[PDB]
Amino acid sequence: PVWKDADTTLFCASDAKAYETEVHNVWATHACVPTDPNPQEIHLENVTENFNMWKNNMVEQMHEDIISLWDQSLQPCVKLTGGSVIKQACPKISFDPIPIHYCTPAGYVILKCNDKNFNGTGPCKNVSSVQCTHGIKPVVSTQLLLNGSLAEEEIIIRSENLTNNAKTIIVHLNKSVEINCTRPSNDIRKAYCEINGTKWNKVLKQVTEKLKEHFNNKTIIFQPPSGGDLEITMHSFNCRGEFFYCNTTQLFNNTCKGCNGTITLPCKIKQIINMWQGTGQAMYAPPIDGKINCVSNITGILLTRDGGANNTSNETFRPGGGDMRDNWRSELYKYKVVQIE
Ligand SMILES: N=C(N)N1CCC[C@H]1C(=O)N1CCN(C(=O)N2C[C@H](CO)C[C@H](C(=O)Nc3ccc(Cl)c(F)c3)C2)CC1
Ligand SMILES: *[C@@H]1O[C@H](CO)[C@@H](O)[C@H](O)[C@H]1NC(C)=O
Ligand SMILES: *[C@@H]1O[C@H](CO)[C@@H](O)[C@H](O)[C@H]1NC(C)=O
Ligand SMILES: *[C@@H]1O[C@H](CO)[C@@H](O)[C@H](O)[C@H]1NC(C)=O
Ligand SMILES: *[C@@H]1O[C@H](CO)[C@@H](O)[C@H](O)[C@H]1NC(C)=O
Ligand SMILES: *[C@@H]1O[C@H](CO)[C@@H](O)[C@H](O)[C@H]1NC(C)=O
Ligand SMILES: *[C@@H]1O[C@H](CO)[C@@H](O)[C@H](O)[C@H]1NC(C)=O
Ligand SMILES: *[C@@H]1O[C@H](CO)[C@@H](O)[C@H](O)[C@H]1NC(C)=O
Ligand SMILES: *[C@@H]1O[C@H](CO)[C@@H](O)[C@H](O)[C@H]1NC(C)=O
Ligand SMILES: *[C@@H]1O[C@H](CO)[C@@H](O)[C@H](O)[C@H]1NC(C)=O
Secondary structure: OOEEEOOOOOEEEEOOOOOOOOHHHHHHHHHOEEOOOOOOOEEOOOOOEEEEOOOOHHHHHHHHHHHHHHHHHOOOOEEEEOOEEEEOOOOOOOOOOOOEEEEOOOOEEEEEEOOOOOOOEEEEOOEEEEOEOOOEOOOOEOOEEEOOOOOOOOOEEEOOOOOOOOOOEEEEEEEEEEEEEEEOOOOOOEEEEEEEHHHHHHHHHHHHHHHHHHOOOOEEEEOOOOOOOHHHHOEEEEEOOEEEEEOOOOOOOOOOOOOOOEEEEEEEEEOEEEOOOOOOEEEOOOOOOOOEEEEEEEEEEEEEEOOOOOOOOEEEEEEOOOOOHHHHHHHHOOEEEEEEO
16 A cells, blocks of 8 residues: 555546436536445555645646536626627526535545544544545535535634735534525515524634634634625625625624524625636626525635734634635545555
């Protein structure tokens, strides 16, 4: 059993259904093979390996897959890019992400870190090997990570470098909080998301506790994003093919008193989007008729820390995504590819 750190082209595997018209199944049918019928996980005795989730080529490869998936599935009525405009066809699609497995070809293996407290960087003491990752749903979103896996013990704070304020922080929850979003059947663009504020505020208290530990028992304060475009100032995500933008100010107010019922976030279905794939603008068709509803699990939070305040008494955090690679990272963090030397 000898190996060395290496990079290589992965392949993908899924349980896509060949009869399904849903666009993730369509994509997986022709670009992935069926998932491993008998997956095998070999434990490595007294092996210690070093991982680095911020420098992991698997993330880059998943990003390209999802870009390609979106480019052949959600085609927009009009793409505006670098001076050129292109009008295409934009029929309403069936959209519901499915888990994708990433798998190494012959000569390579995936090492899997099984330390329950692992924060993404540093040495792992409980390593296994696998031919494929577990199945990861490629959920595109900002501010909140949805429908992901949970941390197994305590809330985990993940950052390439906590001291650097421009480094995005990933909070990995150990308890999911449901967010239930609805555009009622009968303003067709107006919608809302319902969160159990009791559940949310309690989990958010535990996040502050955890952030305290890393920040010298200082005063932890949350605040809405300090400007930017709507995809970053709002919790943005796609629901049955429709782009939802949800004001999360009520989630990131430190108030929490008589605040512990249901939190209704005001939302909008937008037709003009600032693409996350490549720089540009895409215009999609107005929303389908009827009740549009998505019930998801908040499994993590994307946070950006306010810079320039070392001699202040407190650290403020704001929600902030946009770089979808961090979404992939929050699930690939325990994997790394190695060449069997
Ligand atoms: N891809 C690579 N390799 N890179 C290199 C560094 C920068 C990045 C890059 O090159 N790019 C990233 C995206 N790019 C933007 O421009 N973004 C700015 C935009 C606000 O202006 C929002 C964008 C958004 O998150 N969109 C969004 C849309 C729908 C949903 Cl559902 C959603 F969750 C999110 C972020 C351009 C290319
Ligand atoms: C290591 O991880 C394995 C999962 O592969 C699990 O049995 C447990 O969390 C750990 N056990 C040992 C013996 O390290
Ligand atoms: C992650 O754990 C390593 C220990 O190997 C430590 O050096 C690093 O600072 C930790 N990072 C965070 C964000 O806790
Ligand atoms: C949401 O989380 C619950 C428990 O936290 C889990 O049983 C359920 O499968 C999750 N749903 C999705 C869609 O991931
Ligand atoms: C989640 O982690 C926090 C510490 O970050 C801990 O206080 C809490 O009890 C944990 N909850 C579960 C269900 O593991
Ligand atoms: C982390 O960021 C701080 C501030 O930007 C920097 O001074 C420090 O050297 C960084 N640490 C590493 C290991 O890069
Ligand atoms: C989600 O909210 C809608 C409208 O508020 C409601 O009709 C539906 O039953 C809710 N679903 C769940 C699973 O809570
Ligand atoms: C909200 O969550 C709490 C604790 O998780 C639960 O006890 C309560 O019943 C929930 N409220 C509603 C309206 O479901
Ligand atoms: C979100 O709602 C708050 C309160 O209604 C408002 O002040 C804020 O400007 C809203 N955010 C955006 C991006 O519109
Ligand atoms: C999360 O998973 C549920 C259950 O599979 C699905 O109905 C929902 O639309 C998903 N949410 C997102 C944003 O993909």
